[PDB]
RNA sequence: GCAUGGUUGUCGUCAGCUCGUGUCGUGAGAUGUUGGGUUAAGUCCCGCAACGAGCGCAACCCUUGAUUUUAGUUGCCAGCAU
């Protein structure tokens, strides 16, 4: 439900170079401009409404969703969207095997939640010097790496992601398990391996942002 | 002692040897254990299709080098006479 020119002011049309782009987007490219490839804005606001569609009844159970950040300009622009959904995001780097191998995540995100319940109550000046600084250490790491999706309890119903691109593990893992995938592409990316495909510039901020909105915006009430 | 249990040497106190789940390959297999610095050491951190774990490395043990308290005999003799 987004009009055409709020992804204009937002940037969205932009495309990749020309010399590196992938021949199956050739039905979302309209008139190639100067070194650049510009996108279908009406094909886009076809897409978004779409996706907007479909994102609702996987929630509407009050189920799980999983987003992925792993580019570098989507990295704060997905945890400040995730916070008020209510639901899992990963930023970072993504470990390998989140999805796949789920049991040894979970058994290490245990050993999280009990270093975080062993200094609220319990007593640490007790352990030497070298223990307390390395578990602090060890904590700060693991973190940083599993951060949200520490509440999170069973497989999920549905994924986003910005570059399916650079998240290869992420959407070949997803596939692997059956579980379906809505994430924008470049137009570089591959479009058969996405469901939901919603052509869109990713190396703005403005333009994942106009469109995380709309994601998040689009969960808050679908719960209820 | 080429049918064995037990015990021992050697590579060598060298730093390696594997596993569970996951993933790639039709298959034997592969990653984790490779890449950068670093150290006596797969010791440490960073990076990464891997996440962890086990036996070794290191630490816990004995001795030498300084010092406080209690203890003064058969030990020591500064300050006391023989
Ligand atoms: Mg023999
Ligand atoms: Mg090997
Ligand atoms: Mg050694
Ligand atoms: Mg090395
Ligand atoms: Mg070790």
């Given at each position: 439900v987004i009009s055409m020119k709020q992804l204009l002011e937002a940037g969205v049309h932009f495309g990749?170079?020309?010399?590196?782009?992938?021949?199956?987007?050739?039905?979302?490219?309209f008139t190639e401009r100067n070194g650049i490839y510009i996108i279908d804005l009406?094909?886009?606001?076809?897409?978004?409404?779409?996706?907007?569609n479909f994102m609702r009844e996987v929630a509407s159970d009050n189920g799980?969703?999983?987003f992925v950040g792993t580019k570098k300009q989507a990295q704060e622009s997905v945890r400040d969207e995730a916070i008020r959904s209510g639901?899992?995001?990963?930023?970072?780097r993504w470990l390998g095997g989140t999805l796949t191998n789920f049991e040894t995540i979970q058994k290490r995100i245990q050993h999280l939640k009990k270093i975080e319940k062993m200094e609220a109550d319990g007593t640490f000046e007790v352990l030497p010097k070298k223990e307390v600084v390395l578990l602090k250490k060890e904590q700060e790491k693991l973190e940083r790496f599993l951060?949200?999706?520490?509440?999170?309890?069973?497989?999920?119903?549905?994924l986003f992601?910005?570059?399916?691109?650079?998240?290869?593990?992420?959407?070949?893992?997803?596939?692997?398990?059956?579980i379906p995938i809505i994430g924008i592409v470049?137009?570089?990316?591959?479009?058969?391996e996405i469901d939901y495909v919603i052509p869109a510039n990713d190396d703005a901020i403005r333009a994942v942002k106009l469109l995380?909105?709309?994601?998040?915006?689009?969960?808050?009430?679908?719960?209820?």
């Amino acid at each position: 439900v987004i009009s055409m020119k709020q992804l204009l002011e937002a940037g969205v049309h932009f495309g990749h170079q020309t010399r590196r782009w992938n021949p199956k987007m050739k039905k979302y490219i309209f008139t190639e401009r100067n070194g650049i490839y510009i996108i279908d804005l009406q094909k886009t606001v076809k897409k978004v409404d779409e996706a907007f569609n479909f994102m609702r009844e996987v929630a509407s159970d009050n189920g799980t969703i999983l987003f992925v950040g792993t580019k570098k300009q989507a990295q704060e622009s997905v945890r400040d969207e995730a916070i008020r959904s209510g639901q899992y995001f990963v930023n970072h780097r993504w470990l390998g095997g989140t999805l796949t191998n789920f049991e040894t995540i979970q058994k290490r995100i245990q050993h999280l939640k009990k270093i975080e319940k062993m200094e609220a109550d319990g007593t640490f000046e007790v352990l030497p010097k070298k223990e307390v600084v390395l578990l602090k250490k060890e904590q700060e790491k693991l973190e940083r790496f599993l951060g949200g999706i520490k509440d999170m309890k069973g497989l999920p119903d549905a994924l986003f992601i910005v570059d399916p691109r650079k998240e290869r593990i992420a959407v070949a893992e997803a596939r692997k398990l059956h579980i379906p995938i809505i994430g924008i592409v470049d137009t570089n990316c591959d479009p058969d391996e996405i469901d939901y495909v919603i052509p869109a510039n990713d190396d703005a901020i403005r333009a994942v942002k106009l469109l995380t909105a709309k994601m998040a915006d689009a969960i808050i009430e679908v719960n209820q």
